[PDB]
Amino acid sequence: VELTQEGMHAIFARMGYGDITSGSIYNGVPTIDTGALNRQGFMPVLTGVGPHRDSGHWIMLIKGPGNQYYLFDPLGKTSGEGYQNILAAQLPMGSTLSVIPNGSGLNMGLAGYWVASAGLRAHQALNQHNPPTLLNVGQTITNEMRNELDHDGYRKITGWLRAVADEFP
Amino acid sequence: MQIFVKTLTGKTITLEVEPSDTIENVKAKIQDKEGIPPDQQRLIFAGKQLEDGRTLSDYNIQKESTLHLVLRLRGG
């Protein structure tokens, strides 16, 4: 039901993104390849892992226009602000990191799916000539997550995650 | 000799090894530099996963070769 690090990379390859670089917060120490983030425009980050825990949480960094970066936490805005300060220090100088203001209570333990799905839609929404406000991007994310769960999304995503976990270790 | 171990997170780890080093010893060396327990490590070279009980010479790993390190971690 949880997406492994290799499973995340395999997902983006099958989606036509090639070989991606991801990030992590391992034992409290972040590893963010900002050159790859600038080139990819996004980066899934596996947090909450370390020497005594292999099961954590997926979040998504997003590069906007100019020097703007965004953090999409599937657990909601306040969960994302817990990572904002340590992840901001990893960005190039002159950058600003903003947490996408989406609602809480909709992750359902499917952060790997939300990052690879809603996170990319948030990436395209923020990287266009006339983008909606940051308030509107988070509200769209909250509504889409809630609408997918309303359409039996938990049973469909957990089933799809078990399939991907079966085609890999 | 020096070898390079590349993670999926972009980091490159340089290791001092000998061709007769076992895979378990190479994993233990990675733990001393990065702190990752060997149970979390998957070592890859030439599209092959290195098995415990064998040595680097069994896979024809030379000086300044590049290995890949996938970690047994997940999230939800």
UniProtKB/Swiss-Prot annotation, chain A:
Induction: Expression is induced during the transition from exponential to stationary phase. Disruption phenotype: Cells lacking all four members of the SidE family (SdeA, SdeB, SdeC and SidE) show no intracellular growth defect in mouse bone marrow macrophages (BMM), but display attenuated growth inside the protozoan hosts A.castellanii and D.discoideum. This mutant no longer recruits the endoplasmic reticulum (ER) marker GFP-HDEL to its vacuoles, even at 10 hours post infection, and is unable to induce Rab33b ubiquitination during infection. Is able to ubiquitinate itself, but this modification is not required to ubiquitinate Rab33b. It is found in: Secreted; Host cell. Residues 1-169 are annotated as: Deubiquitinase. The active site is at 57 (for deubiquitinase activity), 73 (for deubiquitinase activity), 111 (nucleophile). Secreted effector that interferes with the host cell ubiquitin pathway and is required for intracellular bacterial replication. Catalyzes the ubiquitination of several mammalian Rab proteins (Rab33b, Rab1, Rab6a and Rab30) during L.pneumophila infection, without engaging the standard cellular enzyme cascade (E1 and E2). Transfers an ADP-ribose moiety from NAD to the 'Arg-42' residue of ubiquitin in a reaction that releases nicotinamide. The modified ubiquitin is subsequently transferred to serine residues of the substrate protein via a phosphoribose linker that results in the release of AMP. Belongs to the SidE family. Contains an N-terminal deubiquitinase domain (DUB). The DUB domain does not interfere with the ubiquitin conjugation activity catalyzed by the central domain of SdeA, which causes toxicity. Interacts with IcmS. This is Ubiquitinating/deubiquitinating enzyme SdeA. The chain holds residues 8 to 176 of 1499 of the full protein.
Curated annotation (Swiss-Prot), chain B:
Changing residue 74 to G: No effect on ADP-ribosylation. The modification Phosphoserine is found at residue 65. The record marks 54, 72 as: Interacts with activating enzyme. There is a cross-link at residue 76 (Glycyl lysine isopeptide (Gly-Lys) (interchain with K-? in acceptor proteins)). The record marks 68 as: Essential for function. It is found in: Cytoplasm; Nucleus; Mitochondrion outer membrane. The modification (Microbial infection) ADP-ribosylthreonine is found at residue 66. Changing residue 63 to R: Abolishes HLTF-mediated polyubiquitination of PCNA. Residues 1-76 form the Ubiquitin-like domain. It comes from the Eukaryota. There is a cross-link at residues 6, 11, 27, 29, 33, 48, 63 (Glycyl lysine isopeptide (Lys-Gly) (interchain with G-Cter in ubiquitin)). Changing residue 65 to E: Phosphomimetic mutant that binds and activates PRKN. Changing residue 44 to D: Impairs ubiquitination by CRL2(KLHDC3) E3 ligase complex. Impairs ubiquitination by CRL2(KLHDC3) E3 ligase complex. Changing residue 75 to R/Q: No effect on ubiquitination by CRL2(KLHDC3) E3 ligase complex. Impairs ubiquitination by CRL2(KLHDC10) E3 ligase complex. Exists either covalently attached to another protein, or free (unanchored). When covalently bound, it is conjugated to target proteins via an isopeptide bond either as a monomer (monoubiquitin), a polymer linked via different Lys residues of the ubiquitin (polyubiquitin chains) or a linear polymer linked via the initiator Met of the ubiquitin (linear polyubiquitin chains). This is Ubiquitin. It comes from Homo sapiens. The gene is UBC.
